Structures are given as structure tokens and as C-alpha cells.
Structure 1
Amino acid sequence: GTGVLTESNKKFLPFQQFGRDIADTTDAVRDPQTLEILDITPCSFGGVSV
């Protein structure tokens, strides 16, 4: 994927790996090397008018 990985305060259960959104897309991940939780945010975008 493509996005911004931010430090999160999500409380994952020890058997959980990913945290999903309403649209069943990946919203939070668990780092496999060090046991920390990250949030994924899409990068900045917006409409343009001329």
C-alpha cells in the first residue's frame, strides 16, 4: 500500500494482526519485527478548481 505510518494508541489483542475500517480496508497494522501498532493514513489530496 501507500500512505503515512503514524504511531498509534490502538489496543490490539495479542492474536490480532490487522485492524480494518468500515470499507474493509486496512486501517492499522502490527509491525512484525518489533511489537508496535501503527495507523495508516492516506496522503494529502484535495480538489482543484481553475
Structure 2
Amino acid sequence: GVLTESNKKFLPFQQRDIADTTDAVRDPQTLEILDITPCSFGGVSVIT
């Protein structure tokens, strides 16, 4: 996926969705907060 910036209060350690998919990770080094977003994908319609 793609790692973006997000600003929420994350005092609890490490990682989170309805489907329990992870939305943030605590970096083992340079401890900060990142966000995970799936790669852009979509259906293709072939008009002819």
C-alpha cells in the first residue's frame, strides 16, 4: 500500500478498522505515526 501522514492522538502503543484492517503503524525507529491506504485500483469498462 501507500504510506501517508495522519495526525491523531495515539498514546496506546502500536496499531483498527471495521474489517480490522490496519490504518496506522508505530515506526520501530524514529517513532512516529504513518497511515496505510490501499493502492488505487478500479474496474475497467470497455465501451465499443
Identical positions, percent: 100
Partner of 1:4: 2
RMSD (Å), alpha carbons: 1.4
Partner of 1:46: 42
Distance (whole Å) between structure 1 residues aligned to residue 19 and residue 34 of structure 2: 19
CA shift at 1:23, angstroms?
A: 0.4
SS in structure 2 at match of 1:32: coil
CA shift at 1:15, angstroms?
A: 3.4
Q: Figure out how many residues of one structure are paired with residues of the other and give that number.
A: 46
Distance (whole Å) between structure 1 residues aligned to residue 21 and residue 43 of structure 2: 23
Where is the strand percentage greater, Structure 1 or Structure 2?
Answer: 2
TM-score (norm 2): 0.80
Structure 2: runs of 5 or more not aligned? none
Runs of 4+ in 1 over 2 A off after TM superposition: 14-17
SS in structure 1 at match of 2:25: strand
TM-score (norm 1): 0.77
Distance (whole Å) between structure 1 residues aligned to residue 24 and residue 33 of structure 2: 7
